[PDB]
C-alpha cells in the first residue's frame, strides 16, 4: 500500500497543494512522479495573510513568490498567476483533494489486490 | 547521473562552490566522489558575514553543498551529447 499510487490516479483534477513554506498552490494537477513530484499547470499561487496585525508573515515565502515572476504589481494580496510550476516532492505538506471525487473507486490498490489474489 | 559525472570531469580546474551555511569557497579541485564530497586546494574562503581567509586544503561534506560552479568550457563535454556511439562491450 503506497498512497503515491493513489495520488497518481487523479491526473486531471483540481487540487490545492499547500507547501511547507505556507504558500498554497491552486491549479489543475498533471502526472505525479513516484516521489510525489507534482506538476501543476494552470496555477494560482497565493500566501495566506495571518490576519493578525503584529504577526507579519513568512518572509522567505514572499521572496520566493515574487521571484517566481508572476506576481501582479497592482495585486493587494500576494498572488502570482503563472503556468506550469513543477513542485518538488519533499516540499508538499498536505494536498486538499476536490470534494466531488469518489474515494472508494480510487483507493483500491490494484497491485495489493493482485498480490492478495496471487497469494 | 549526469551532474555527478560532470563534477568528476571538472577535476584539476578552479571551481567555486557555496555551502548551505552561507560560506563560499573557490580553488583547485583535487578529488570528488560519487556522493558530491569535494576536496579543494588553495581555497579562498568567504565566511557568511564577509570576512575572507585562506587555507591549504578543505574537505566539505556533499550534503551541505548548495551549488558548484565549474569552468564554462565544460559545456562541450562529450558526456553532454545525447546520441552516442558505444564500442559494443565484449562478453
Amino acid at each position: 500500500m503506497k498512497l503515491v499510487n493513489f495520488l497518481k490516479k487523479l491526473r486531471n483534477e483540481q487540487v490545492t497543494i499547500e507547501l511547507k513554506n505556507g504558500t498554497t498552490v491552486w491549479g489543475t494537477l498533471q502526472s505525479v512522479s513516484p516521489q510525489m513530484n507534482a506538476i501543476l499547470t494552470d496555477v494560482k499561487l497565493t500566501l495566506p495573510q495571518p490576519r493578525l496585525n503584529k504577526l507579519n508573515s513568512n518572509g522567505i515565502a514572499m521572496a520566493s513568490l515574487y521571484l517566481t515572476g508572476g506576481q501582479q504589481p497592482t495585486a493587494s494580496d500576494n498572488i502570482a498567476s503563472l503556468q506550469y510550476i513543477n513542485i518538488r516532492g519533499n516540499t508538499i505538506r498536505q494536498i486538499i483533494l476536490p470534494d466531488s471525487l469518489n474515494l472508494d473507486s480510487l483507493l483500491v490498490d490494484q497491485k495489493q489486490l493482485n498480490s492478495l489474489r496471487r497469494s | 547521473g549526469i551532474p555527478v559525472k560532470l563534477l568528476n570531469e571538472a577535476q584539476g580546474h578552479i571551481v567555486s562552490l557555496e555551502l548551505t551555511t552561507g560560506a563560499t569557497y573557490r580553488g583547485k579541485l583535487v578529488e570528488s566522489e560519487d556522493s558530491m564530497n569535494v576536496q579543494l586546494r588553495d581555497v579562498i574562503a568567504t565566511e557568511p558575514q564577509g570576512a575572507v581567509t585562506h587555507m591549504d586544503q578543505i574537505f566539505v561534506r556533499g550534503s551541505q553543498i548548495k551549488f558548484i560552479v565549474v569552468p564554462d568550457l565544460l559545456k562541450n563535454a562529450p558526456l553532454f551529447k545525447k546520441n552516442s556511439s558505444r564500442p559494443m562491450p565484449p562478453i
Binding site: - | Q11, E31, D34, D42, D56, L73, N76, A77, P78, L79, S84, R86, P87, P89, P90
Partner: protein, 178 residues
C-alpha cells in the same frame, strides 16, 4: 559498466583508484587535451553572423546614397586569401600566447630575488612544487655577486616593433654606437 568518453575504451566497472588510475595516465591525459583544443578551436574559427533583415529602402534614403559615388571593392584570389588567412591565424595565436616578463629579468640580482620570482619557493603556490635544472635555492645571500656590473649581466633587449611597419623606423640613429 562505465567507459571513458575520450579514450572510448570500455572499462570494467570501477569507482575507486581504478578511475583515478585511468584518468591519471597518458592515454587519458593528452587525449583529453586534444579534445578540448579542438572544441575551443572551433569557437575561435566560427564565422556565422547574425540573421540579416533587409528593409525596403525609401526614396529619401536612396537618393542621397545614390548621389555620392560608387566604392570599389578590394578582392583577392583563392590562393592569396588562403595564405592571408593562414598568416592572420598564426599571428593571432602568436600574439595571444605572448607574455611580457621584463620585470622578471630586470630584478635578476635583487636581494630577495629567490623568494619571489623563482615561483618554486613562493609562499602561496609553492605548496604544489614542494617520478619527474639548476634551480635557484632560497638560501642565497646578498654577499654573492657583491658588484653586479662585473660583466655578469647583459644589455636590455631592444624593444620589438611591428614587421608590417618596419620601414617606418628612422633611417639613422642620432649617435654613433659601436
Amino acid at each position: 559498466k562505465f567507459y571513458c568518453d575520450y579514450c572510448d575504451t570500455y572499462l570494467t566497472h570501477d569507482s575507486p583508484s581504478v578511475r583515478k588510475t585511468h584518468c591519471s595516465g597518458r592515454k587519458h591525459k593528452e587525449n583529453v587535451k586534444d579534445y578540448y583544443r579542438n572544441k575551443a578551436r572551433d569557437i575561435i574559427n566560427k564565422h556565422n553572423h547574425k540573421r540579416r533583415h533587409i528593409g525596403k529602402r525609401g526614396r529619401k534614403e536612396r537618393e542621397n546614397s545614390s548621389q555620392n559615388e560608387t566604392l570599389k571593392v578590394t578582392c583577392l584570389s583563392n590562393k592569396e586569401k588562403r595564405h592571408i588567412m593562414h598568416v592572420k591565424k598564426m599571428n593571432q595565436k602568436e600574439l595571444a600566447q605572448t607574455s611580457i616578463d621584463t620585470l622578471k629579468l630586470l630584478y635578476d640580482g635583487s636581494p630577495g630575488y629567490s623568494k619571489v620570482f623563482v615561483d618554486a619557493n613562493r609562499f602561496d603556490i609553492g605548496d604544489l612544487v614542494k617520478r619527474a635544472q639548476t634551480s635557484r635555492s632560497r638560501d642565497e645571500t646578498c654577499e654573492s655577486n657583491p658588484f653586479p656590473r662585473l660583466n655578469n649581466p647583459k644589455k636590455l633587449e631592444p624593444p620589438k616593433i611591428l614587421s608590417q611597419w618596419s620601414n617606418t623606423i628612422p633611417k639613422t640613429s642620432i649617435f654613433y654606437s659601436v
